[PDB]
Copies of this chain bind each other. A is one copy, B any other.
Amino acid sequence: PRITARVDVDTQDLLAKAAALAGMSSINSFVLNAAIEKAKQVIEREQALKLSQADAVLLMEALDNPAVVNAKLKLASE
């Protein structure tokens, strides 16, 4: 139930400068917020990669059953 990490000199320097700029008062706060935002981005990216293949899934269906896919499209415009 605890996120925890060792930092060395260079990372502390990096995170403190970023926390200052980001208006945070602690490194800990900066880190937690950075992690949640990235978690959301990673999760959204996987869903988005699925949807981006949607044209090809549909093309593969059309290649297999061109007439049925044309009929389905024709029904949808009614």
Q: Do B2 and A4 touch (CB < 8 A)?
A: yes
CB-CB under 8 A from A38, the residues of chain B are 18, 30, 34, 37-38
Q: Do A17 and B43 touch (CB < 8 A)?
A: yes
Which residue of the partner chain, among B22, B27, B46, contacts A3 with CB atoms under 8 Å?
A: B27
Which residue of the partner chain, among B6, B34, B39, B42, contacts A2 with CB atoms under 8 Å?
A: B6
CB nearest neighbor in B for A45: B21
Would you list which residues of chain A between 22 and 48 have a CB under 8 Å from chain B? 22, 27-32, 34-40, 42-43, 46
29 A-B residue pairings within 8 Å (CB atoms): A1-B8, A1-B9, A2-B5, A2-B6, A2-B7, A3-B3, A3-B4, A3-B5, A3-B27, A5-B29, A5-B31, A5-B32, A14-B40, A14-B43, A15-B35, A15-B39, A17-B43, A18-B39, A21-B46, A22-B42, A30-B35, A30-B38, A31-B32, A31-B34, A31-B35, A34-B34, A34-B37, A35-B35, A38-B38
